Design an enzyme around this catalytic site. Structure first.
Site, mmCIF file in Angstrom:
data_model
loop_
_atom_site.group_PDB
_atom_site.id
_atom_site.type_symbol
_atom_site.label_atom_id
_atom_site.label_comp_id
_atom_site.label_asym_id
_atom_site.label_seq_id
_atom_site.Cartn_x
_atom_site.Cartn_y
_atom_site.Cartn_z
ATOM 1 N N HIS A 1 -38.973 5.930 30.694
ATOM 2 C CA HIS A 1 -39.153 6.976 31.701
ATOM 3 C C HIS A 1 -37.864 7.738 31.965
ATOM 4 O O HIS A 1 -37.923 8.915 32.313
ATOM 5 C CB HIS A 1 -39.723 6.408 33.017
ATOM 6 C CG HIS A 1 -41.183 6.000 32.767
ATOM 7 N ND1 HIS A 1 -42.217 6.559 33.440
ATOM 8 C CD2 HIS A 1 -41.715 5.099 31.908
ATOM 9 C CE1 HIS A 1 -43.364 6.000 33.023
ATOM 10 N NE2 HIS A 1 -43.076 5.111 32.061
ATOM 11 N N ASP B 1 -29.983 9.790 30.611
ATOM 12 C CA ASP B 1 -28.833 10.190 31.441
ATOM 13 C C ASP B 1 -28.754 9.555 32.799
ATOM 14 O O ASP B 1 -27.917 9.947 33.631
ATOM 15 C CB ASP B 1 -28.907 11.718 31.512
ATOM 16 C CG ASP B 1 -30.144 12.287 32.150
ATOM 17 O OD1 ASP B 1 -30.969 11.460 32.590
ATOM 18 O OD2 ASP B 1 -30.355 13.513 32.297
ATOM 19 N N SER C 1 -30.898 9.873 35.075
ATOM 20 C CA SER C 1 -31.431 10.808 36.073
ATOM 21 C C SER C 1 -32.494 10.206 36.976
ATOM 22 O O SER C 1 -32.584 10.490 38.173
ATOM 23 C CB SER C 1 -31.974 12.077 35.437
ATOM 24 O OG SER C 1 -33.211 11.880 34.773
ATOM 25 N N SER D 1 -46.498 -5.021 24.447
ATOM 26 C CA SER D 1 -46.624 -6.459 24.233
ATOM 27 C C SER D 1 -45.893 -7.256 25.301
ATOM 28 O O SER D 1 -46.231 -8.449 25.422
ATOM 29 C CB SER D 1 -45.971 -6.767 22.859
ATOM 30 O OG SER D 1 -46.247 -8.122 22.507
ATOM 31 N N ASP E 1 -51.504 -7.551 27.066
ATOM 32 C CA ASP E 1 -51.944 -8.502 26.028
ATOM 33 C C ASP E 1 -51.902 -9.900 26.630
ATOM 34 O O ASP E 1 -51.416 -10.099 27.764
ATOM 35 C CB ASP E 1 -51.239 -8.345 24.651
ATOM 36 C CG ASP E 1 -49.853 -8.940 24.613
ATOM 37 O OD1 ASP E 1 -49.329 -9.623 25.514
ATOM 38 O OD2 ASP E 1 -49.209 -8.732 23.563
ATOM 39 N N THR F 1 -50.145 -12.384 25.945
ATOM 40 C CA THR F 1 -48.832 -13.032 25.927
ATOM 41 C C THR F 1 -47.783 -12.122 26.523
ATOM 42 O O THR F 1 -46.871 -11.708 25.786
ATOM 43 C CB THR F 1 -48.430 -13.418 24.490
ATOM 44 O OG1 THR F 1 -48.536 -12.267 23.573
ATOM 45 C CG2 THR F 1 -49.403 -14.462 23.869
ATOM 46 N N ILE G 1 -44.090 -12.813 25.620
ATOM 47 C CA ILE G 1 -43.683 -13.000 24.230
ATOM 48 C C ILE G 1 -43.736 -11.668 23.489
ATOM 49 O O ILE G 1 -44.789 -11.034 23.559
ATOM 50 C CB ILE G 1 -44.672 -13.946 23.500
ATOM 51 C CG1 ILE G 1 -44.774 -15.333 24.198
ATOM 52 C CG2 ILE G 1 -44.235 -14.157 22.046
ATOM 53 C CD1 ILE G 1 -45.859 -16.158 23.462
ATOM 54 N N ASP H 1 -44.647 -10.009 20.605
ATOM 55 C CA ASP H 1 -45.459 -10.299 19.426
ATOM 56 C C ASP H 1 -46.492 -9.204 19.202
ATOM 57 O O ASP H 1 -46.439 -8.167 19.872
ATOM 58 C CB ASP H 1 -46.123 -11.679 19.558
ATOM 59 C CG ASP H 1 -47.025 -11.761 20.779
ATOM 60 O OD1 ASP H 1 -47.241 -10.669 21.420
ATOM 61 O OD2 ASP H 1 -47.507 -12.834 21.180
HETATM 62 CA CA CA Z 1 -47.165 -10.148 23.836
HETATM 63 CA CA CA Z 2 -33.465 11.026 32.344
#
Ligand code: CA
Ligand code: CA
Ligand code: HEM
EC number: 1.11.1.14
Length: 348
Positions: free
Chosen positions: A51, A72, A74, A181, A198, A200, A203, A205
């Site tokens: 983001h 940056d 921001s 994941s 998911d 896991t 983890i 994966d």
């Molecule tokens: Ca996973």
């Molecule tokens: Ca930024």
């Protein structure tokens, strides 16, 4: 001009300026990630990198407007502005937990966000050996809105946005979605926070790529929320963009390529994560402090790298890759079980 140096702890790094990040590491492992866990704060830190970084637009700059600075800091510097944007919903909580560390250690906000993201990933078993480069000057303007993808955007809109931001193609889009994941959803379903993508979420994966390809049969909490589609397991959420990327003819074979292929997953994500953290920056002007990042750990135990969750078999897969049949995986034993939620800190 880099100066290879041995720090006070006895470790050798690429430049003497990197040594000060060992004190930052120790502080965040203990006080932000609760002893090095791949839990809620680590997931939020990995989301924050995307983001902060993807908010950059050469197309707006060509129109005479400021399109954002890329990686940056921001979103931290102007948090009152960027965290009010709908795509950045829920991020002011992790920004507020990170700010005190920036102030105490005197590092730039952009470099801290990239650092915490890489350390967070190093806490999740299976993660690639992560990189960390420094040099991002503090942003001087907030990014505009309209630059961070939403779960209800079409595949074409998302492909076009990441192509504008960093010249990333449709295959690279799939590479960066591997981060789902180790991730959960706090703000899409208003009745429950912490639904993993998911089975896991601790983890790194390919279960995200297996489980998003199964037939969606129910909503895990309330039905019909914007950007949400049915998922295949109790407790797991599935968003519309992931669901459609996995079945689109442009991206479906790349999505399936990570199933049962740990080395491609780790190599492709290592590559694309570094690229996201360099957005808006000149790579040759940055310093490599990757030797401060802890070594990632292997997935423990002796289960196969990829598997079907209990209760699911090849008949539940919606095959979308026309070139290669989905791999025949083993199924875990017993009845289908719900994925456990990951409760977030207050304010998420
Ligand atoms: Ca996973
Ligand atoms: Ca930024
Ligand atoms: C390209 C399009 C993407 C879309 C539409 C998307 C969508 C979402 C959504 C809707 C959520 C839940 C947010 C909330 O409930 O507050 C989420 C969470 C997450 N996303 Fe993405 N995502 C995208 C790409 C990425 C990428 C490239 C990364 C790489 C770091 C990323 C990492 C995460 C993580 C780690 C979480 C979990 C946050 C947590 O557990 O608190 N996402 N994503």
């Amino acid at each position: 001009i880099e100066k290879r140096a041995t720090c006070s702890n006895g470790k050798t790094v690429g430049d003497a300026s990197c040594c000060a990040w060992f004190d930052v590491l120790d502080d965040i492992q203990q006080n932000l990630f609760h002893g090095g866990q791949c839990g809620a704060e680590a997931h939020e830190s990995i989301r924050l990198v995307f983001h902060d970084s993807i908010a950059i637009s050469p197309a707006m700059e060509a129109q005479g407007k400021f399109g954002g600075g890329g990686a940056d800091g921001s979103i931290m510097i102007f948090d009152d502005i960027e965290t009010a944007f709908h795509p950045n919903i829920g991020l002011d909580e992790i920004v507020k937990l990170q700010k005190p560390f920036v102030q105490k250690h005197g590092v730039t906000p952009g470099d801290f966000i990239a650092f915490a993201g890489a350390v967070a990933l190093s806490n999740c078993p299976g993660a690639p050996q992560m990189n960390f480069f420094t040099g991002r000057a503090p942003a001087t303007q907030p990014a505009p809105d309209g630059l961070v993808p939403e779960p209800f955007h079409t595949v074409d809109q998302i492909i076009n946005r990441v192509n504008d931001a960093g010249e990333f193609d449709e295959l690279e889009l799939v590479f960066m979605l591997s981060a789902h994941s180790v991730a959960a959803v706090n703000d899409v379903d208003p009745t429950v926070q912490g639904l993993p993508f998911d089975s896991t979420p601790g983890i790194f994966d390919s279960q995200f790529f297996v489980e998003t390809q199964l037939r969606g049969t129910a909503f895990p909490g309330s039905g019909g929320n914007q950007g949400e589609v049915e998922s295949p397991l109790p407790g797991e959420i599935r968003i519309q963009s992931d669901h459609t990327i996995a079945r689109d003819s442009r991206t479906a074979c790349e999505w399936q390529s990570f199933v049962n292929n740990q080395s491609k997953l780790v190599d492709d994500f290592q590559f694309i994560f570094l690229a996201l953290t360099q957005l808006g920056q000149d790579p040759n002007a940055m310093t490599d402090c990757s030797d401060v990042i802890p070594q990632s750990k292997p997935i423990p135990g002796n289960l196969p790298f990829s598997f079907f969750p209990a209760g699911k078999t090849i008949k539940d897969v919606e095959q979308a890759c026309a070139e290669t049949p989905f791999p025949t995986l083993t199924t875990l034993p017993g009845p289908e079980t719900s994925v456990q939620r990951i409760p977030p800190p207050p304010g998420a």
